[PDB]
Specification:
The complex is a heterodimer. By secondary structure, chain A is of the alpha+beta class. Chain A has 12 helices and 10 strands. Chain B has one domain (about 10-40). Chain B contains 2 helices and 3 strands. The chains are: A alpha+beta, B alpha+beta. The complex binds agmatine. The site of agmatine has 12 residues of chain A, from loops. Chain B: This is DNA, SC102.
Amino acid sequence: VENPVETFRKLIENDSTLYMLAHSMFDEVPEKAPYDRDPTTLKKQVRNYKTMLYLFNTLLTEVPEYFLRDNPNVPSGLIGFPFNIIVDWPMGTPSGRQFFLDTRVNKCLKDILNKWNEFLKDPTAQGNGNKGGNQALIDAGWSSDAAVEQLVNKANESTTDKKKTFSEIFQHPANGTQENFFNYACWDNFFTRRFKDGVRPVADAAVVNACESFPLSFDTDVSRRNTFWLKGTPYSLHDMLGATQDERVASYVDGFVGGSVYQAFLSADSYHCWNAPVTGKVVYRSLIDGTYFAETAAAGFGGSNGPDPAGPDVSQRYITHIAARGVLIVDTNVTGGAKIGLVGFVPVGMSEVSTCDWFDNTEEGKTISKGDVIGAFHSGG
Amino acid sequence: XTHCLIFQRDAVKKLQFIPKAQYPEIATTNLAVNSELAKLT
Ligand SMILES: *NCCCCNC(=N)N
């Protein structure tokens, strides 16, 4: 069993083209400020792939740091994302764009980030006592007033029924307090925490919000396939839903032609589980392998909206077509359903929050009820 | 993280989406999970 960072090292060094790209994607980052530092401004920018690999290996046993405790005013878009911080500027280069589209690179990143995820769900933090996972969160700043207030404020902004304290909003283990970071056993349990009963009541409407999320796009009359790479990123159902590689979904692509696509963004300080947007019977479910750190040319250096200091934020429409993601298609033309035909739910990874976790209640042939928790994002690949 | 919800053409004819979702530039906060996104008309 090989260190996945070491497998990645060998991929880079044993392929002449990837070896080239792994240098050029750093050479193409400008030397001048602000690019001498990563987007947080707190550390020097990494300039070679060996330092990158060293840091990736070190990160395999680290939880993300809440760096806003001691540095409240620096850019905060990459809170939660230590890998993203390292490669953010290289992602915006022509050679970096090519690198992070390579399927072998992305298999290696998948294995690295999945090894990370093993640590993030480890309540011992890899052999540091039964409370190691919890202690690592406290050490990383997450029990600070700044972090807890941020989490409470973000939950409160979407509702009129605002709560004073974290424990009134989210479920956490017994005897949890701010001082012991609510006794969360590990990052993964904190990350996928559930709302307390009655804090997110299920509305009477036929369609409810599937994620605690910030509206991004609403597109009507979408095409079967489209030039998703052109400016404005028109949605391309065929690519998004994975009909490229699974003929079984192609009939659903056809049935969504002329339909509407709604997209919304989940921040790092938001609830990360998925709830059933409608009641109905699951007719299709898939997971689709893809990219992690792929963003548009417009989001890169010299781009009309780049370089993105928190890529792939400004590329969210684009990555629905290529990022690690999942597909769920629900038939509402059933008893107790709203009779609004087929509804698609497509969770899409961003960077190292790309683990798409379908819960067992979404198996094809099962019926889900509007508001049921049906899965979650995790930090990982 | 991000996610899409996808609806069929004839279903959209029957649905009224909330403005914060249908006109996303007006949104200033998260929408609450489980809250109304669209209603039958
Ligand atoms: N959808 C998970 C949060 C993504 C935050 N942005 C980023 N890591 N670039």
